Amino acid sequence: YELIQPSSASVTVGETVKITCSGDQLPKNFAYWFQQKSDKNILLLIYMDNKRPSGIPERFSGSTSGTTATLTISGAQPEDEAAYYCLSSYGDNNDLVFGSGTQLTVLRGPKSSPKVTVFPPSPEELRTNKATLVCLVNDFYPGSATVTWKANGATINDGVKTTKPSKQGQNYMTSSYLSLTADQWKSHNRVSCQVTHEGETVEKSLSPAECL
Amino acid sequence: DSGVVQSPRHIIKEKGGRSVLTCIPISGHSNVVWYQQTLGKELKFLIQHYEKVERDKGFLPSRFSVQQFDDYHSEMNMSALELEDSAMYFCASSLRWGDEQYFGPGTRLTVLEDLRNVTPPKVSLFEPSKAEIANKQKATLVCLARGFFPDHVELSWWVNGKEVHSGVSTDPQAYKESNYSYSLSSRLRVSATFWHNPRNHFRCQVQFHGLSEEDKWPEGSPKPVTQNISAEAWGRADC
Amino acid sequence: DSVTQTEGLVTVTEGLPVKLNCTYQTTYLTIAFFWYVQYLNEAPQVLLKSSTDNKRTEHQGFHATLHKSSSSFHLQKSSAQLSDSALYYCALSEGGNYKYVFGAGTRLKVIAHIQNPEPAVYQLKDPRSQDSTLCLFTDFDSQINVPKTMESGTFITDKTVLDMKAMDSKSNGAIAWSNQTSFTCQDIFKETNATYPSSDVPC
Amino acid sequence: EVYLVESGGDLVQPGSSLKVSCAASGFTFSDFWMYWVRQAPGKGLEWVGRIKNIPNNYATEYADSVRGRFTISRDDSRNSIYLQMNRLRVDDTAIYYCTRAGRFDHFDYWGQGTMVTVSSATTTAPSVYPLAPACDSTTSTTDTVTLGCLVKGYFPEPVTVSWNSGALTSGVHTFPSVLHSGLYSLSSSVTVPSSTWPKQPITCNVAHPASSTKVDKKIEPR
Numbered sequence: 001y002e003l004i005q006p007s008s009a010s011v012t013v014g015e016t017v018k019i020t021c022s023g024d025q026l027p028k029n030f031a032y033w034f035q036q037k038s039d040k041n042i043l044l045l046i047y048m049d050n051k052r053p054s055g056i057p058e059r060f061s062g063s064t065s066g067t068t069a070t071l072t073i074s075g076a077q078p079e080d081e082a083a084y085y086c087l088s089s090y091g092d093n094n095d096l097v098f099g100s101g102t103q104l105t106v107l108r109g110p111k112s113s114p115k116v117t118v119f120p121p122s123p124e125e126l127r128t129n130k131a132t133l134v135c136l137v138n139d140f141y142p143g144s145a146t147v148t149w150k151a152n153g154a155t156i157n158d159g160v161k162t163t164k165p166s167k168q169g170q171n172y173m174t175s176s177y178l179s180l181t182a183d184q185w186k187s188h189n190r191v192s193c194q195v196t197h198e199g200e201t202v203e204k205s206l207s208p209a210e211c212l
Numbered sequence: 213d214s215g216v217v218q219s220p221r222h223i224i225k226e227k228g229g230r231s232v233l234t235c236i237p238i239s240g241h242s243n244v245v246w247y248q249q250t251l252g253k254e255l256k257f258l259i260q261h262y263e264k265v266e267r268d269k270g271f272l273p274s275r276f277s278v279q280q281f282d283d284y285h286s287e288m289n290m291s292a293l294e295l296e297d298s299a300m301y302f303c304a305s306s307l308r309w310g311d312e313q314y315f316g317p318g319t320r321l322t323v324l325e326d327l328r329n330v331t332p333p334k335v336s337l338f339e340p341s342k343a344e345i346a347n348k349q350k351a352t353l354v355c356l357a358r359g360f361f362p363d364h365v366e367l368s369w370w371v372n373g374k375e376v377h378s379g380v381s382t383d384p385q386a387y388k389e390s391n392y393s394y395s396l397s398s399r400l401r402v403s404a405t406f407w408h409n410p411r412n413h414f415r416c417q418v419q420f421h422g423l424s425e426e427d428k429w430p431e432g433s434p435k436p437v438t439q440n441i442s443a444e445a446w447g448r449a450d451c
Numbered sequence: 452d453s454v455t456q457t458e459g460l461v462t463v464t465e466g467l468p469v470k471l472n473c474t475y476q477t478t479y480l481t482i483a484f485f486w487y488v489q490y491l492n493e494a495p496q497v498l499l500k501s502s503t504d505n506k507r508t509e510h511q512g513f514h515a516t517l518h519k520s521s522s523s524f525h526l527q528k529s530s531a532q533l534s535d536s537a538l539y540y541c542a543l544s545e546g547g548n549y550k551y552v553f554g555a556g557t558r559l560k561v562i563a564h565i566q567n568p569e570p571a572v573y574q575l576k577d578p579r580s581q582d583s584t585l586c587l588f589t590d591f592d593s594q595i596n597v598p599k600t601m602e603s604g605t606f607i608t609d610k611t612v613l614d615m616k617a618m619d620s621k622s623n624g625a626i627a628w629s630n631q632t633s634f635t636c637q638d639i640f641k642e643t644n645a646t647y648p649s650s651d652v653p654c
Numbered sequence: 655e656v657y658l659v660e661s662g663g664d665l666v667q668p669g670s671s672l673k674v675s676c677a678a679s680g681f682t683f684s685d686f687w688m689y690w691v692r693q694a695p696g697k698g699l700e701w702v703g704r705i706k707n708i709p710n711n712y713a714t715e716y717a718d719s720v721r722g723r724f725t726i727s728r729d730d731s732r733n734s735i736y737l738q739m740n741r742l743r744v745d746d747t748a749i750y751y752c753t754r755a756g757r758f759d760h761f762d763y764w765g766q767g768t769m770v771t772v773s774s775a776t777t778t779a780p781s782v783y784p785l786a787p788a789c790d791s792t793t794s795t796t797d798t799v800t801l802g803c804l805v806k807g808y809f810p811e812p813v814t815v816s817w818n819s820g821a822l823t824s825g826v827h828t829f830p831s832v833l834h835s836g837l838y839s840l841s842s843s844v845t846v847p848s849s850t851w852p853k854q855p856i857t858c859n860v861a862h863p864a865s866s867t868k869v870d871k872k873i874e875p876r
């Protein structure tokens with residue numbers, strides 16, 4: 001069948017969170033909780049839906065009632081913000097299955113602001129007659145900031161591509177790109193990259209693209 | 213029924229586990245009492261009930277709470293099971309106060325630390341000895357069930373599809389081959405003539421008892437469930 | 452209150468008599484005394500029960516007469532069959548408390564008597580797995596003390612009687628097995644008073 | 655010291671066939687069932703199948719997602735299990751992980767994995783282009799300075815991007831890749847104090863395992 005798991009999750013350092021995995025055949029089959037860090041390493045947190053392996057944090061309990069097993073991170077910590085997948089079986093041949101994984105985020109408190117950094121197309125880049133404008137944004141917490149470019153004060157919606165990664169222990173980042181016809185940038189006027197940091201109507205503007 | 217009924221007859225569980233025992237008293241009898249036999253056989257009084265759930269208490273652990281029903285069906289609620297609770301829980305019944313009690317088949321439950329330690333046995337049929345046959349004019353078939361844990365087994369001999377007891381001798385109690393490994397052997401003796409008969413079948417069946425419905429078995433190997441493992445051989449080895 | 456009875460094992464040889472001692476201690480008027488026999492792998496069943504102070508209460512072999520004076524419901528059986536091998540419980544029911552007192556218990560092990568003892572230890576094989584250090588000690592006297600294991604991987608069970616298809620005498624057994632595939636039945640069976648018959652296979 | 659090493663991944667055209675293996679070391683491969691598990695980039699963990707040992711008839715079981723095309727095989731003589739994948743589909747592109755299940759150990763050790771790319775495209779060598787500002791956009795808090803490299807034009811598995819061959823580790827920022835017209839792209843930033851680079855070398859060493867991408871790009875000023 002299918003195993004349900006909340007799409008995400010959020011807990012504040014020190015406090016405690018609860019991830020639920022609902023499985024129709026849970027009552028009949030065991031559960032297993034795994035942890036996947038940005039590093040992509042698979043970590044077995046709990047097994048037999050309530051027996052934690054030595055070497056793992058005691059704050060990782062794993063109860064399980066009826067058709068819903070649960071991982072419980074007591075006094076959640078920072079280095080705990082990663083992916084969580086519940087595992088179990090189904091059918092006569094005990095088929096195996098994972099949940100849709102859960103993305104818990106650990107709130108800290110130090111609300112920082114954006115740190116944009118636009119970058120004009122490379123000379124050799126234009127050589128290939130290509131204008132790829134890289135607009136970055138650093139040191140910010142928490143909410144994702146929608147980095148929208150603008151041309152002469154009018155949003156741009158073509159050839160763009162952005163992300164919303166988060167690494168550097170307590171430090172979020174992004175890499176909002178933007179392609180452009182070499183003869184579009186050479187013939188452009190006000191290449192922008194408006195960032196919108198959470199909590200504030202933020203607009204680090206930094207209206208770039210002006211010099212030569 | 214004019215006979216006490218007890219269920220289940222075998223319960224294996226892990227600590228913290230929670231099971232329930234059942235007892236169908238002999239029809240007519242009002243007085244129902246639950247007894248527990250521990251290591252070596254020492255009948256101990258738990259809680260007695262007379263005509264509905266009227267009671268005279270005993271050493272019945274608070275975790276265990278039994279009650280009677282209209283049909284007089286009485287069940288024993290076991291909760292927070294511990295290795296110490298590993299016993300033979302018999303249920304006896306009787307009529308008016310003072311005359312002849314009747315024990316049911318009993319429910320032998322075994323609470324263990326690690327279920328994963330449960331495991332079926334390995335039946336092996338060892339044929340007679342050429343010597344024995346010649347000298348004593350007899351054929352002794354040795355059967356040896358090995359490496360299994362909960363000594364919840366019952367070896368049975370089967371010759372030609374029919375069960376047999378004449379000439380059979382199973383070990384009284386299974387030995388502890390290891391700390392987590394038991395073993396039980398038995399033997400059967402038939403004439404050198406019967407053994408020689410190639411049209412004669414011999415089967416040693418070992419009824420093992422494992423987990424059931426509440427099969428919360430680790431998803432890393434086969435759940436050892438109650439089962440029948442055997443080993444069979446025919447007549448004279450062909451020369 | 453209590454009903455104390457013999458604590459030994461009372462080993463007996465078929466044919467000789469038996470006698471399990473049982474005395475009681477009650478504060479109320481006893482209503483009836485009973486003897487329970489619980490056979491290996493079986494629930495405890497009544498063997499016989501009594502209420503009068505002299506009724507050679509008889510049943511499938513056993514007999515036991517009660518005597519209030521000296522407070523006793525002793526049990527005895529002249530001839531002892533191997534079937535009698537079981538656990539025995541002495542109990543009673545007394546007035547007032549309604550109590551149904553039970554006796555500690557007494558194990559009973561009747562052994563066989565071999566006419567012409569033919570001590571012998573053979574080594575049987577297993578067509579299945581290649582490993583199989585098995586030995587069979589049979590027809591040895593019912594009084595000899597079968598040796599015990601001296602090392603791991605090895606093991607010597609306890610003697611056991613078998614009476615094949617009602618024809619004649621029975622036979623005492625005791626099998627041993629080990630992993631020390633270096634040993635032999637004679638060695639495995641330390642202190643040996645037997646013949647270890649064996650040789651190469653014809654054909 | 656229990657070790658599980660996957661091997662065999664590769665980028666191959668759809669409808670193809672790939673046979674990846676899983677190596678073992680640090681235990682009795684004997685009393686353990688092994689399993690296969692892949693995972694799509696942004697997708698969750700997905701179980702492929704399992705293969706019991708000999709005492710269990712080596713019984714094999716596959717998820718529904720690949721019951722008729724994917725197969726597993728065990729080789730005790732080598733202490734390994736394999737995955738024969740046929741009629742592959744792009745949606746098969748993933749990193750395959752193999753784990754184990756014993757009498758008491760369950761899904762404890764996982765291998766690094768092995769990438770399988772099922773797509774109708776070819777290794778498109780990357781192209782790194784220096785990123786540098788200095789357009790004194792009056793409102794300069796240039797307490798520090800940043801820049802990097804724009805690796806663009808690659809598509810195969812992940813790549814590597816160092817700086818000054820490691821020396822520079824603080825102030826670096828390798829963001830997550832980006833799918834653009836079937837071609838990947840990635841940049842790497844670095845932040846130092848205003849007076850540290852125009853003088854000291856701020857080179858970035860890009861790599862692309864797929865195709866010998868021994869690149870170095872001494873970022874000179876404009």
Ligand SMILES: *[C@@H]1O[C@H](CO)[C@@H](O)[C@H](O)[C@H]1NC(C)=O
Nearest residue numbers: 232275277287288289290291
């Ligand atoms: C048994 O008793 C426990 C008390 O801890 C209770 O939770 C449970 O519902 C009872 N179940 C039965 C079948 O008596």
Ligand SMILES: *[C@@H]1O[C@H](CO)[C@@H](O)[C@H](O)[C@H]1NC(C)=O
Nearest residue numbers: 325326328329391392393758
């Ligand atoms: C279970 O049995 C195995 C083998 O007998 C033993 O190694 C282990 O210590 C036992 N208990 C547990 C929790 O593994």
Ligand SMILES: *[C@@H]1O[C@H](CO)[C@@H](O)[C@H](O)[C@H]1NC(C)=O
Nearest residue numbers: 324325326329390391392393
């Ligand atoms: C197992 O053996 C250990 C010795 O290490 C002993 O302490 C323990 O009581 C034994 N447990 C069982 C269930 O036999």
Ligand SMILES: *[C@@H]1O[C@H](CO)[C@@H](O)[C@H](O)[C@H]1NC(C)=O
Nearest residue numbers: 368417418419439440441442
């Ligand atoms: C196991 O025992 C049951 C009941 O005695 C019998 O019906 C069944 O055939 C046995 N199984 C085997 C494999 O002999």
Ligand SMILES: *[C@H]1O[C@H](CO)[C@@H](O)[C@H](O)[C@H]1NC(C)=O
Nearest residue numbers: 456457458459461470471472
């Ligand atoms: C009572 O006497 C008999 C006769 O020998 C003996 O076997 C029994 O052990 C005695 N009772 C006790 C408690 O020793």
Ligand SMILES: *[C@H]1O[C@H](CO)[C@@H](O)[C@H](O)[C@H]1NC(C)=O
Nearest residue numbers: 390602603604605629630631
């Ligand atoms: C053989 O004896 C036991 C069981 O066969 C086994 O555990 C042991 O390793 C072996 N003997 C020795 C001395 O190792």
Ligand SMILES: *[C@H]1O[C@H](CO)[C@@H](O)[C@H](O)[C@H]1NC(C)=O
Nearest residue numbers: 568570592595643644645646
């Ligand atoms: C040794 O002791 C026995 C007991 O069986 C006696 O019958 C006999 O004289 C002796 N037999 C052997 C083989 O030593």
